[PDB]
């Protein structure tokens, strides 16, 4: 409602740009619950190298509980193309949206906008 | 610090 994030998403400075809308930590499967069946997942790619498959294992956990599924991606790495390609293939099968940010503020913006 | 926990995000 006024968002629900996972306490496993703390630390992440993107929460610092979630200023225009109210948000709070809740125990939910996805990273952010934005509506009764809309939910997002954050994957900082740079971290994507450091132990990946987690984003893959993260979508199977979510399964199908939310209608609008979205993947917030922070492009914090040069020459990202390669990964985006294999991540996108994953999203069509998972039928979730692929969104691209490049800063912790930009993604933070993407959150105020989906609840707005 | 550098304690990358879990959550698709570098820490």
CSV table of N, CA, C and O in Angstrom, one decimal:
chain,number,residue,atom,x,y,z
A,1,UNK,N,0.9,-1.2,0.0
A,1,UNK,CA,0.0,0.0,0.0
A,1,UNK,C,0.9,1.2,0.0
A,1,UNK,O,1.6,1.4,-1.0
A,2,UNK,N,1.2,1.8,1.1
A,2,UNK,CA,2.3,2.7,1.1
A,2,UNK,C,3.3,1.5,1.3
A,2,UNK,O,3.2,0.6,2.1
A,3,UNK,N,4.2,1.4,0.3
A,3,UNK,CA,5.1,0.1,0.1
A,3,UNK,C,5.3,-0.8,1.2
A,3,UNK,O,5.2,-0.5,2.4
A,4,UNK,N,5.8,-2.0,0.8
A,4,UNK,CA,6.3,-3.1,1.7
A,4,UNK,C,7.6,-3.5,1.1
A,4,UNK,O,7.7,-3.9,0.0
A,5,UNK,N,8.7,-3.4,1.8
A,5,UNK,CA,10.0,-3.8,1.3
A,5,UNK,C,10.5,-5.0,2.1
A,5,UNK,O,10.0,-5.3,3.1
A,6,UNK,N,11.6,-5.7,1.7
A,6,UNK,CA,12.1,-6.8,2.5
A,6,UNK,C,13.3,-6.3,3.4
A,6,UNK,O,14.1,-5.6,2.9
A,7,UNK,N,13.3,-6.7,4.6
A,7,UNK,CA,14.4,-6.3,5.5
A,7,UNK,C,15.7,-6.9,5.0
A,7,UNK,O,16.7,-6.5,5.4
A,8,UNK,N,15.6,-7.7,4.0
A,8,UNK,CA,16.7,-8.2,3.3
A,8,UNK,C,17.2,-7.2,2.3
A,8,UNK,O,18.1,-7.4,1.6
A,9,UNK,N,16.4,-6.1,2.2
A,9,UNK,CA,16.8,-5.0,1.3
A,9,UNK,C,17.3,-3.8,2.0
A,9,UNK,O,17.7,-2.8,1.5
A,10,UNK,N,17.4,-3.9,3.3
A,10,UNK,CA,18.0,-2.8,4.1
A,10,UNK,C,19.3,-2.4,3.6
A,10,UNK,O,19.7,-2.8,2.5
A,11,UNK,N,20.1,-1.6,4.3
A,11,UNK,CA,21.4,-1.2,3.8
A,11,UNK,C,21.2,-0.6,2.4
A,11,UNK,O,21.3,0.6,2.3
A,12,UNK,N,20.9,-1.3,1.4
A,12,UNK,CA,20.7,-0.8,0.0
A,12,UNK,C,20.3,0.7,0.1
A,12,UNK,O,19.2,1.0,0.5
A,13,UNK,N,21.2,1.6,-0.4
A,13,UNK,CA,21.0,3.1,-0.4
A,13,UNK,C,19.8,3.5,-1.3
A,13,UNK,O,19.3,4.6,-1.2
A,14,UNK,N,19.4,2.7,-2.2
A,14,UNK,CA,18.2,3.1,-3.0
A,14,UNK,C,17.1,3.5,-2.1
A,14,UNK,O,16.3,4.4,-2.4
A,15,UNK,N,16.9,2.8,-1.0
A,15,UNK,CA,15.8,3.2,-0.1
A,15,UNK,C,15.9,4.7,0.3
A,15,UNK,O,14.9,5.3,0.6
A,16,UNK,N,17.1,5.2,0.2
A,16,UNK,CA,17.3,6.7,0.5
A,16,UNK,C,16.6,7.5,-0.5
A,16,UNK,O,16.3,8.7,-0.3
A,17,UNK,N,16.4,7.0,-1.7
A,17,UNK,CA,15.7,7.9,-2.7
A,17,UNK,C,14.2,7.6,-2.7
A,17,UNK,O,13.5,8.3,-3.4
A,18,UNK,N,13.8,6.7,-1.8
A,18,UNK,CA,12.3,6.5,-1.7
A,18,UNK,C,11.8,7.6,-0.8
A,18,UNK,O,11.6,7.3,0.4
A,19,UNK,N,11.7,8.8,-1.3
A,19,UNK,CA,11.3,9.9,-0.4
A,19,UNK,C,9.9,10.4,-0.6
A,19,UNK,O,9.2,10.8,0.3
A,20,UNK,N,9.5,10.4,-1.8
A,20,UNK,CA,8.1,11.0,-2.1
A,20,UNK,C,7.0,10.0,-1.7
A,20,UNK,O,5.9,10.4,-1.6
A,21,UNK,N,7.3,8.8,-1.4
A,21,UNK,CA,6.2,7.9,-1.0
A,21,UNK,C,6.6,7.1,0.3
A,21,UNK,O,7.8,6.8,0.5
A,22,UNK,N,5.6,6.9,1.2
A,22,UNK,CA,5.8,6.1,2.4
A,22,UNK,C,6.1,4.6,2.1
A,22,UNK,O,5.5,4.0,1.3
A,23,UNK,N,7.1,4.0,2.8
A,23,UNK,CA,7.4,2.6,2.6
A,23,UNK,C,7.8,2.0,3.9
A,23,UNK,O,8.3,2.7,4.8
A,24,UNK,N,7.7,0.7,4.1
A,24,UNK,CA,8.1,0.0,5.3
A,24,UNK,C,8.5,-1.4,5.1
A,24,UNK,O,8.0,-2.0,4.1
A,25,UNK,N,9.3,-1.9,6.0
A,25,UNK,CA,9.7,-3.4,5.8
A,25,UNK,C,8.6,-4.4,6.2
A,25,UNK,O,8.0,-4.3,7.2
A,26,UNK,N,8.4,-5.3,5.4
A,26,UNK,CA,7.4,-6.3,5.7
A,26,UNK,C,7.9,-7.7,5.3
A,26,UNK,O,8.8,-7.8,4.5
A,27,UNK,N,7.3,-8.7,5.8
A,27,UNK,CA,7.8,-10.1,5.4
A,27,UNK,C,7.1,-10.5,4.1
A,27,UNK,O,6.2,-11.2,4.2
A,28,UNK,N,7.6,-10.1,3.0
A,28,UNK,CA,7.0,-10.6,1.7
A,28,UNK,C,8.0,-11.3,0.7
A,28,UNK,O,9.2,-11.1,0.8
A,29,UNK,N,7.5,-12.1,-0.1
A,29,UNK,CA,8.4,-12.9,-1.1
A,29,UNK,C,9.3,-12.0,-2.0
A,29,UNK,O,10.5,-12.2,-2.1
A,30,UNK,N,8.7,-11.0,-2.6
A,30,UNK,CA,9.5,-10.2,-3.6
A,30,UNK,C,10.3,-9.2,-2.8
A,30,UNK,O,10.3,-9.2,-1.6
A,31,UNK,N,10.9,-8.3,-3.5
A,31,UNK,CA,11.7,-7.2,-2.8
A,31,UNK,C,10.8,-6.1,-2.5
A,31,UNK,O,10.8,-5.6,-1.3
A,32,UNK,N,10.0,-5.7,-3.4
A,32,UNK,CA,9.0,-4.6,-3.0
A,32,UNK,C,7.6,-4.9,-3.5
A,32,UNK,O,7.4,-5.2,-4.6
A,33,UNK,N,6.7,-4.7,-2.6
A,33,UNK,CA,5.3,-4.9,-3.0
A,33,UNK,C,4.7,-3.5,-3.3
A,33,UNK,O,4.7,-2.6,-2.5
A,34,UNK,N,4.3,-3.3,-4.5
A,34,UNK,CA,3.8,-1.9,-4.9
A,34,UNK,C,2.3,-1.9,-5.0
A,34,UNK,O,1.7,-0.9,-5.0
A,35,UNK,N,1.6,-3.1,-5.1
A,35,UNK,CA,0.1,-3.1,-5.2
A,35,UNK,C,-0.4,-4.6,-4.9
A,35,UNK,O,0.4,-5.5,-4.7
A,36,UNK,N,-1.7,-4.8,-4.8
A,36,UNK,CA,-2.2,-6.2,-4.4
A,36,UNK,C,-1.6,-7.3,-5.3
A,36,UNK,O,-1.4,-8.4,-4.9
A,37,UNK,N,-1.2,-7.0,-6.5
A,37,UNK,CA,-0.6,-8.1,-7.3
A,37,UNK,C,0.6,-7.6,-8.1
A,37,UNK,O,1.0,-8.2,-9.1
A,38,UNK,N,1.1,-6.5,-7.7
A,38,UNK,CA,2.3,-5.9,-8.5
A,38,UNK,C,3.5,-6.0,-7.5
A,38,UNK,O,3.4,-5.7,-6.3
A,39,UNK,N,4.6,-6.5,-8.0
A,39,UNK,CA,5.8,-6.6,-7.1
A,39,UNK,C,7.1,-6.5,-7.9
A,39,UNK,O,7.2,-6.8,-9.0
A,40,UNK,N,8.1,-6.0,-7.3
A,40,UNK,CA,9.4,-5.8,-8.0
A,40,UNK,C,10.5,-6.6,-7.4
A,40,UNK,O,10.4,-7.1,-6.2
A,41,UNK,N,11.6,-6.7,-8.0
A,41,UNK,CA,12.8,-7.4,-7.5
A,41,UNK,C,14.1,-6.6,-7.9
A,41,UNK,O,14.2,-6.2,-9.0
A,42,UNK,N,15.0,-6.4,-7.0
A,42,UNK,CA,16.2,-5.6,-7.3
A,42,UNK,C,17.4,-6.5,-7.4
A,42,UNK,O,17.6,-7.3,-6.6
A,43,UNK,N,18.1,-6.2,-8.4
A,43,UNK,CA,19.4,-7.0,-8.7
A,43,UNK,C,20.5,-6.0,-9.1
A,43,UNK,O,20.4,-5.5,-10.2
A,44,UNK,N,21.4,-5.7,-8.3
A,44,UNK,CA,22.4,-4.7,-8.7
A,44,UNK,C,23.4,-5.1,-9.7
A,44,UNK,O,24.4,-4.5,-9.9
A,45,UNK,N,23.2,-6.2,-10.4
A,45,UNK,CA,24.2,-6.7,-11.5
A,45,UNK,C,25.6,-6.7,-10.9
A,45,UNK,O,26.1,-7.8,-10.8
A,46,UNK,N,26.2,-5.6,-10.6
A,46,UNK,CA,27.6,-5.7,-10.1
A,46,UNK,C,27.6,-6.9,-9.1
A,46,UNK,O,28.4,-7.8,-9.1
A,47,UNK,N,26.6,-6.9,-8.2
A,47,UNK,CA,26.5,-8.0,-7.3
A,47,UNK,C,26.1,-9.2,-8.1
A,47,UNK,O,26.4,-10.3,-7.7
A,48,UNK,N,25.4,-9.0,-9.2
A,48,UNK,CA,25.0,-10.2,-10.1
A,48,UNK,C,26.2,-11.1,-10.3
A,48,UNK,O,26.1,-12.3,-10.3
A,49,UNK,N,27.4,-10.5,-10.5
A,49,UNK,CA,28.6,-11.4,-10.8
A,49,UNK,C,28.8,-12.1,-9.4
A,49,UNK,O,28.7,-13.3,-9.4
A,50,UNK,N,29.1,-11.4,-8.4
A,50,UNK,CA,29.3,-12.0,-7.1
A,50,UNK,C,28.1,-12.9,-6.8
A,50,UNK,O,27.0,-12.4,-6.5
A,51,UNK,N,28.2,-14.2,-6.9
A,51,UNK,CA,27.1,-15.1,-6.7
A,51,UNK,C,25.8,-14.6,-7.4
A,51,UNK,O,25.1,-13.9,-6.8
A,52,UNK,N,25.6,-15.2,-8.6
A,52,UNK,CA,24.4,-14.9,-9.4
A,52,UNK,C,23.4,-16.1,-9.2
A,52,UNK,O,23.4,-16.6,-8.1
A,53,UNK,N,22.6,-16.4,-10.2
A,53,UNK,CA,21.6,-17.6,-9.9
A,53,UNK,C,20.7,-17.2,-8.8
A,53,UNK,O,19.5,-17.6,-8.8
A,54,UNK,N,21.1,-16.3,-7.9
A,54,UNK,CA,20.2,-15.9,-6.8
A,54,UNK,C,19.0,-15.2,-7.5
A,54,UNK,O,17.9,-15.4,-7.2
A,55,UNK,N,19.3,-14.3,-8.5
A,55,UNK,CA,18.1,-13.7,-9.1
A,55,UNK,C,17.3,-14.7,-9.8
A,55,UNK,O,16.0,-14.6,-9.7
A,56,UNK,N,17.9,-15.7,-10.3
A,56,UNK,CA,17.1,-16.8,-11.0
A,56,UNK,C,16.3,-17.5,-9.9
A,56,UNK,O,15.1,-17.6,-9.9
A,57,UNK,N,17.0,-17.9,-8.8
A,57,UNK,CA,16.4,-18.6,-7.7
A,57,UNK,C,15.4,-17.7,-6.9
A,57,UNK,O,14.6,-18.1,-6.1
A,58,UNK,N,15.5,-16.4,-7.2
A,58,UNK,CA,14.5,-15.4,-6.5
A,58,UNK,C,13.2,-15.4,-7.3
A,58,UNK,O,12.1,-15.2,-6.7
A,59,UNK,N,13.2,-15.5,-8.6
A,59,UNK,CA,11.9,-15.4,-9.3
A,59,UNK,C,11.2,-16.7,-9.1
A,59,UNK,O,10.0,-16.7,-8.9
A,60,UNK,N,11.8,-17.9,-9.0
A,60,UNK,CA,11.1,-19.2,-8.8
A,60,UNK,C,10.4,-19.1,-7.4
A,60,UNK,O,9.3,-19.7,-7.2
A,61,UNK,N,11.1,-18.5,-6.5
A,61,UNK,CA,10.5,-18.4,-5.1
A,61,UNK,C,9.2,-17.6,-5.2
A,61,UNK,O,8.2,-17.9,-4.7
A,62,UNK,N,9.3,-16.5,-5.9
A,62,UNK,CA,8.1,-15.6,-6.0
A,62,UNK,C,6.9,-16.5,-6.7
A,62,UNK,O,5.8,-16.3,-6.4
A,63,UNK,N,7.3,-17.3,-7.6
A,63,UNK,CA,6.3,-18.2,-8.3
A,63,UNK,C,5.3,-17.4,-9.2
A,63,UNK,O,5.6,-17.2,-10.4
A,64,UNK,N,4.2,-17.1,-8.7
A,64,UNK,CA,3.2,-16.4,-9.5
A,64,UNK,C,2.2,-15.6,-8.6
A,64,UNK,O,1.1,-15.3,-9.0
A,65,UNK,N,2.5,-15.3,-7.3
A,65,UNK,CA,1.6,-14.6,-6.4
A,65,UNK,C,1.2,-13.2,-6.8
A,65,UNK,O,0.2,-12.6,-6.3
A,66,UNK,N,2.0,-12.5,-7.6
A,66,UNK,CA,1.6,-11.1,-8.0
A,66,UNK,C,1.4,-10.9,-9.5
A,66,UNK,O,2.3,-11.4,-10.3
A,67,UNK,N,0.4,-10.3,-9.9
A,67,UNK,CA,0.2,-10.1,-11.3
A,67,UNK,C,1.3,-9.3,-12.0
A,67,UNK,O,2.1,-9.7,-12.8
A,68,UNK,N,1.5,-8.0,-11.6
A,68,UNK,CA,2.5,-7.3,-12.3
A,68,UNK,C,3.9,-7.6,-11.7
A,68,UNK,O,4.2,-7.1,-10.6
A,69,UNK,N,4.7,-8.3,-12.4
A,69,UNK,CA,6.0,-8.6,-11.8
A,69,UNK,C,7.0,-7.7,-12.6
A,69,UNK,O,6.9,-7.5,-13.8
A,70,UNK,N,7.9,-7.1,-11.8
A,70,UNK,CA,8.9,-6.1,-12.5
A,70,UNK,C,10.3,-6.4,-11.9
A,70,UNK,O,10.5,-6.6,-10.8
A,71,UNK,N,11.3,-6.2,-12.8
A,71,UNK,CA,12.8,-6.4,-12.3
A,71,UNK,C,13.6,-5.1,-12.3
A,71,UNK,O,14.1,-4.7,-13.3
A,72,UNK,N,13.8,-4.4,-11.2
A,72,UNK,CA,14.5,-3.1,-11.2
A,72,UNK,C,16.0,-3.4,-11.3
A,72,UNK,O,16.6,-4.1,-10.5
A,73,UNK,N,16.6,-2.9,-12.3
A,73,UNK,CA,18.1,-3.3,-12.5
A,73,UNK,C,18.9,-2.0,-12.3
A,73,UNK,O,18.7,-1.1,-13.0
A,74,UNK,N,19.9,-2.0,-11.5
A,74,UNK,CA,20.8,-0.8,-11.4
A,74,UNK,C,22.0,-1.0,-12.3
A,74,UNK,O,22.9,-1.8,-12.0
A,75,UNK,N,22.1,-0.3,-13.4
A,75,UNK,CA,23.3,-0.5,-14.3
A,75,UNK,C,24.5,0.2,-13.7
A,75,UNK,O,24.9,1.3,-14.0
A,76,UNK,N,25.1,-0.5,-12.7
A,76,UNK,CA,26.4,0.1,-12.1
A,76,UNK,C,27.6,-0.7,-12.6
A,76,UNK,O,28.5,-0.9,-11.8
A,77,UNK,N,27.6,-1.1,-13.8
A,77,UNK,CA,28.8,-1.8,-14.4
A,77,UNK,C,29.0,-1.4,-15.9
A,77,UNK,O,28.0,-1.3,-16.6
A,78,UNK,N,30.2,-1.2,-16.3
A,78,UNK,CA,30.5,-0.9,-17.7
A,78,UNK,C,30.4,-2.2,-18.6
A,78,UNK,O,30.7,-3.2,-18.2
A,79,UNK,N,29.9,-2.0,-19.8
A,79,UNK,CA,29.8,-3.2,-20.7
A,79,UNK,C,28.7,-4.3,-20.2
A,79,UNK,O,29.0,-5.5,-20.2
A,80,UNK,N,27.7,-3.8,-19.7
A,80,UNK,CA,26.6,-4.6,-19.1
A,80,UNK,C,25.9,-5.5,-20.2
A,80,UNK,O,25.3,-6.5,-19.9
A,81,UNK,N,25.8,-5.0,-21.4
A,81,UNK,CA,25.1,-5.7,-22.4
A,81,UNK,C,25.0,-7.2,-22.2
A,81,UNK,O,23.9,-7.7,-22.1
A,82,UNK,N,26.1,-7.9,-22.2
A,82,UNK,CA,26.0,-9.4,-22.1
A,82,UNK,C,25.0,-9.8,-21.1
A,82,UNK,O,24.1,-10.6,-21.3
A,83,UNK,N,25.2,-9.4,-19.8
A,83,UNK,CA,24.2,-9.9,-18.8
A,83,UNK,C,22.8,-9.5,-19.2
A,83,UNK,O,21.9,-10.3,-19.2
A,84,UNK,N,22.5,-8.2,-19.4
A,84,UNK,CA,21.1,-7.9,-19.8
A,84,UNK,C,20.5,-8.9,-20.7
A,84,UNK,O,19.4,-9.4,-20.5
A,85,UNK,N,21.2,-9.2,-21.7
A,85,UNK,CA,20.7,-10.2,-22.7
A,85,UNK,C,20.2,-11.5,-22.0
A,85,UNK,O,19.1,-11.8,-22.0
A,86,UNK,N,21.1,-12.2,-21.2
A,86,UNK,CA,20.6,-13.4,-20.5
A,86,UNK,C,19.6,-13.1,-19.4
A,86,UNK,O,18.8,-13.9,-19.0
A,87,UNK,N,19.6,-11.9,-18.9
A,87,UNK,CA,18.6,-11.6,-17.9
A,87,UNK,C,17.3,-11.5,-18.6
A,87,UNK,O,16.3,-12.0,-18.1
A,88,UNK,N,17.2,-10.7,-19.6
A,88,UNK,CA,16.0,-10.5,-20.4
A,88,UNK,C,15.3,-11.8,-20.8
A,88,UNK,O,14.1,-12.1,-20.6
A,89,UNK,N,16.1,-12.8,-21.3
A,89,UNK,CA,15.6,-14.1,-21.7
A,89,UNK,C,14.9,-14.7,-20.5
A,89,UNK,O,13.8,-15.2,-20.6
A,90,UNK,N,15.5,-14.6,-19.3
A,90,UNK,CA,14.8,-15.0,-18.1
A,90,UNK,C,13.5,-14.3,-17.9
A,90,UNK,O,12.5,-15.0,-17.5
A,91,UNK,N,13.4,-13.0,-18.1
A,91,UNK,CA,12.2,-12.2,-17.8
A,91,UNK,C,11.1,-12.6,-18.7
A,91,UNK,O,9.9,-12.6,-18.4
A,92,UNK,N,11.3,-12.9,-20.0
A,92,UNK,CA,10.2,-13.3,-20.9
A,92,UNK,C,9.6,-14.6,-20.4
A,92,UNK,O,8.4,-14.7,-20.2
A,93,UNK,N,10.4,-15.5,-20.1
A,93,UNK,CA,9.9,-16.8,-19.6
A,93,UNK,C,9.2,-16.5,-18.3
A,93,UNK,O,8.0,-16.9,-18.1
A,94,UNK,N,9.8,-15.7,-17.4
A,94,UNK,CA,9.1,-15.3,-16.1
A,94,UNK,C,8.0,-14.3,-16.3
A,94,UNK,O,7.3,-13.9,-15.4
A,95,UNK,N,8.0,-13.8,-17.5
A,95,UNK,CA,6.9,-12.8,-17.9
A,95,UNK,C,6.9,-11.6,-16.8
A,95,UNK,O,5.9,-11.2,-16.4
A,96,UNK,N,8.1,-11.1,-16.5
A,96,UNK,CA,8.2,-9.9,-15.6
A,96,UNK,C,8.9,-8.8,-16.3
A,96,UNK,O,9.7,-9.0,-17.2
A,97,UNK,N,8.6,-7.6,-16.0
A,97,UNK,CA,9.2,-6.4,-16.7
A,97,UNK,C,10.7,-6.2,-16.4
A,97,UNK,O,11.1,-6.4,-15.3
A,98,UNK,N,11.4,-5.7,-17.3
A,98,UNK,CA,12.9,-5.4,-17.1
A,98,UNK,C,13.0,-3.9,-17.0
A,98,UNK,O,12.8,-3.2,-18.0
A,99,UNK,N,13.5,-3.3,-15.9
A,99,UNK,CA,13.6,-1.8,-15.8
A,99,UNK,C,15.1,-1.4,-15.6
A,99,UNK,O,15.8,-2.1,-15.0
A,100,UNK,N,15.5,-0.4,-16.2
A,100,UNK,CA,17.0,0.0,-16.1
A,100,UNK,C,17.3,1.3,-15.4
A,100,UNK,O,16.9,2.3,-15.8
A,101,UNK,N,18.0,1.2,-14.3
A,101,UNK,CA,18.4,2.4,-13.6
A,101,UNK,C,19.9,2.5,-13.7
A,101,UNK,O,20.6,1.6,-14.0
A,102,UNK,N,20.5,3.6,-13.3
A,102,UNK,CA,22.0,3.6,-13.4
A,102,UNK,C,22.5,4.2,-12.1
A,102,UNK,O,23.7,4.1,-11.8
A,103,UNK,N,21.7,4.7,-11.2
A,103,UNK,CA,22.1,5.2,-9.9
A,103,UNK,C,21.2,4.7,-8.8
A,103,UNK,O,20.1,4.3,-9.1
A,104,UNK,N,21.6,4.8,-7.6
A,104,UNK,CA,20.7,4.5,-6.5
A,104,UNK,C,19.6,5.5,-6.4
A,104,UNK,O,18.6,5.2,-6.0
A,105,UNK,N,19.8,6.7,-6.9
A,105,UNK,CA,18.7,7.6,-6.9
A,105,UNK,C,17.7,7.3,-8.0
A,105,UNK,O,16.5,7.2,-7.8
A,106,UNK,N,18.2,7.0,-9.2
A,106,UNK,CA,17.3,6.7,-10.3
A,106,UNK,C,16.3,5.6,-9.9
A,106,UNK,O,15.1,5.7,-10.1
A,107,UNK,N,16.8,4.5,-9.5
A,107,UNK,CA,15.9,3.3,-9.1
A,107,UNK,C,15.0,3.9,-8.0
A,107,UNK,O,13.8,3.7,-8.1
A,108,UNK,N,15.5,4.6,-7.0
A,108,UNK,CA,14.7,5.2,-6.0
A,108,UNK,C,13.6,5.9,-6.7
A,108,UNK,O,12.4,5.8,-6.3
A,109,UNK,N,13.9,6.6,-7.7
A,109,UNK,CA,12.8,7.3,-8.4
A,109,UNK,C,11.8,6.3,-8.9
A,109,UNK,O,10.6,6.4,-8.7
A,110,UNK,N,12.2,5.2,-9.6
A,110,UNK,CA,11.3,4.2,-10.2
A,110,UNK,C,10.4,3.6,-9.1
A,110,UNK,O,9.3,3.1,-9.5
A,111,UNK,N,10.7,3.7,-7.9
A,111,UNK,CA,9.8,3.2,-6.8
A,111,UNK,C,8.7,4.2,-6.6
A,111,UNK,O,7.5,3.9,-6.6
A,112,UNK,N,9.0,5.5,-6.3
A,112,UNK,CA,8.0,6.5,-6.1
A,112,UNK,C,7.0,6.5,-7.3
A,112,UNK,O,5.8,6.7,-7.1
A,113,UNK,N,7.5,6.2,-8.5
A,113,UNK,CA,6.7,6.3,-9.7
A,113,UNK,C,5.7,5.1,-9.9
A,113,UNK,O,4.6,5.2,-10.4
A,114,UNK,N,6.1,3.9,-9.4
A,114,UNK,CA,5.1,2.7,-9.6
A,114,UNK,C,4.0,2.8,-8.5
A,114,UNK,O,2.9,2.4,-8.8
A,115,UNK,N,4.3,3.3,-7.3
A,115,UNK,CA,3.3,3.5,-6.3
A,115,UNK,C,2.4,4.7,-6.7
A,115,UNK,O,1.3,4.9,-6.3
A,116,UNK,N,3.1,5.6,-7.4
A,116,UNK,CA,2.4,6.9,-7.9
A,116,UNK,C,1.6,6.6,-9.2
A,116,UNK,O,0.4,6.4,-9.2
B,1,UNK,N,30.7,-0.9,4.7
B,1,UNK,CA,31.7,-2.0,4.6
B,1,UNK,C,31.6,-2.8,3.3
B,1,UNK,O,31.0,-2.4,2.3
B,2,UNK,N,32.1,-4.0,3.3
B,2,UNK,CA,32.0,-5.0,2.2
B,2,UNK,C,31.3,-6.3,2.6
B,2,UNK,O,31.9,-7.3,2.6
B,3,UNK,N,30.1,-6.2,3.2
B,3,UNK,CA,29.5,-7.5,3.7
B,3,UNK,C,28.3,-7.9,2.8
B,3,UNK,O,27.3,-8.3,3.3
B,4,UNK,N,28.5,-7.7,1.5
B,4,UNK,CA,27.4,-8.1,0.6
B,4,UNK,C,26.5,-9.2,1.2
B,4,UNK,O,26.9,-10.3,1.3
B,5,UNK,N,25.4,-8.8,1.7
B,5,UNK,CA,24.4,-9.8,2.2
B,5,UNK,C,23.7,-10.4,1.1
B,5,UNK,O,24.3,-10.8,0.1
B,6,UNK,N,22.4,-10.5,1.2
B,6,UNK,CA,21.6,-11.1,0.1
B,6,UNK,C,20.4,-10.2,-0.3
B,6,UNK,O,19.7,-9.7,0.6
B,7,UNK,N,20.2,-10.0,-1.6
B,7,UNK,CA,19.1,-9.1,-2.0
B,7,UNK,C,19.4,-8.4,-3.4
B,7,UNK,O,18.9,-7.3,-3.7
B,8,UNK,N,20.2,-9.0,-4.2
B,8,UNK,CA,20.5,-8.4,-5.6
B,8,UNK,C,21.0,-7.0,-5.4
B,8,UNK,O,20.4,-6.1,-5.9
B,9,UNK,N,22.0,-6.8,-4.6
B,9,UNK,CA,22.5,-5.4,-4.4
B,9,UNK,C,23.8,-5.4,-3.7
B,9,UNK,O,24.0,-6.1,-2.8
B,10,UNK,N,24.8,-4.7,-4.2
B,10,UNK,CA,26.2,-4.7,-3.7
B,10,UNK,C,26.2,-4.0,-2.3
B,10,UNK,O,25.8,-2.9,-2.2
B,11,UNK,N,26.9,-4.6,-1.4
B,11,UNK,CA,27.0,-4.0,0.0
B,11,UNK,C,28.4,-4.0,0.5
B,11,UNK,O,29.0,-5.1,0.7
